[PDB]
Amino acid sequence: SWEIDPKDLTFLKELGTGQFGVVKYGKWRGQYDVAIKMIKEGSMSEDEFIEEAKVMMNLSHEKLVQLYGVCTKQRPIFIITEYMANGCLLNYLREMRHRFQTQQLLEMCKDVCEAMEYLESKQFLHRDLAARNCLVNDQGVVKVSDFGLSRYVLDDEYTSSVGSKFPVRWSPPEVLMYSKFSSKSDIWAFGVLMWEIYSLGKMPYERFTNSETAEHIAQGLRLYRPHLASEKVYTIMYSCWHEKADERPTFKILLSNILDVMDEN
Numbered sequence: 001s002w003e004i005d006p007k008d009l010t011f012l013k014e015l016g017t018g019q020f021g022v023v024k025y026g027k028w029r030g031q032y033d034v035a036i037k038m039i040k041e042g043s044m045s046e047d048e049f050i051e052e053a054k055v056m057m058n059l060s061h062e063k064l065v066q067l068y069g070v071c072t073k074q075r076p077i078f079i080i081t082e083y084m085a086n087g088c089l090l091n092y093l094r095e096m097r098h099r100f101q102t103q104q105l106l107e108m109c110k111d112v113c114e115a116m117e118y119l120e121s122k123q124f125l126h127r128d129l130a131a132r133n134c135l136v137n138d139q140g141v142v143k144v145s146d147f148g149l150s151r152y153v154l155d156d157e158y159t160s161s162v163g164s165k166f167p168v169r170w171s172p173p174e175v176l177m178y179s180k181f182s183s184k185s186d187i188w189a190f191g192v193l194m195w196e197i198y199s200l201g202k203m204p205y206e207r208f209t210n211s212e213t214a215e216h217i218a219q220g221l222r223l224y225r226p227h228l229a230s231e232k233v234y235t236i237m238y239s240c241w242h243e244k245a246d247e248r249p250t251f252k253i254l255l256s257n258i259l260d261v262m263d264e265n
């Protein structure tokens, strides 16, 4: 793993707080914009992360937010990642909702699908794919962030499927019932993400609690077609929600589907 020298980092702005604590905007060697997670003590399974971190850094794709390196020779540990000036996709959708053309929404889906096809090809699971875990750069390109980090979280409210922080609304039945994660559970989450994009950042299953969502999706309830989604687009997101995991498409198939819709428009 790339062990970055913390002396080369200059902190510039606070970017808020997440599951591992504070995140800052800064520069590396006075030139390159980076985001820096300062890992709060007790928030992460640190030895496990350090042992496994190289796999994450070796993931390289234009539509993945890069994990550049880490600083682990002191505490707190730092994770250094690609800076994205427009922040998370969820807030971006909500803040600009009167400015998007449908072509732009499809392009966001394409960006994410390309990243996920790459992760699939590396047999690497995201485990918490959602609009809140995608970021947007200064040119409006969407990239997938925080892939694989779910595994290292120490917070029972997040890791328990009945915890109030578990991403129930992005989870297929086999995750909720058996904790069976696979690229097919990432597929399900991607469908929900497509729904978030086309609804311009609405909360999935709003007004339902997490347990009500679980109960009802297990019985067949599915997210309705957003107004801005054509039937072709809805068919794509809906295909992600087959009850049986082996009936769900791969990200390669989804990408082909999305490209077909683009070529038709």
Ligand SMILES: Cc1c(-c2cc(Nc3cc4n(n3)CCN(C)C4)c(=O)[nH]n2)ccc(F)c1NC(=O)c1cc2ccccc2s1
Residues within 6 Å of the ligand: 015, 016, 017, 018, 019, 020, 023, 035, 037, 081, 082, 083, 084, 085, 086, 087, 088, 128, 133, 135, 145, 146, 149, 150, 153
């Ligand atoms: C990714 C991120 C940023 C962030 C924000 C960026 N960009 C921007 C740009 C702006 N903002 N964020 C907010 C303020 N805006 C004015 C500009 C960026 O480039 N990288 N990271 C800032 C605060 C955060 F809380 C997070 N998310 C996390 O750390 C985590 C997500 C997950 C998911 C699963 C498991 C563990 C974790 S830990």
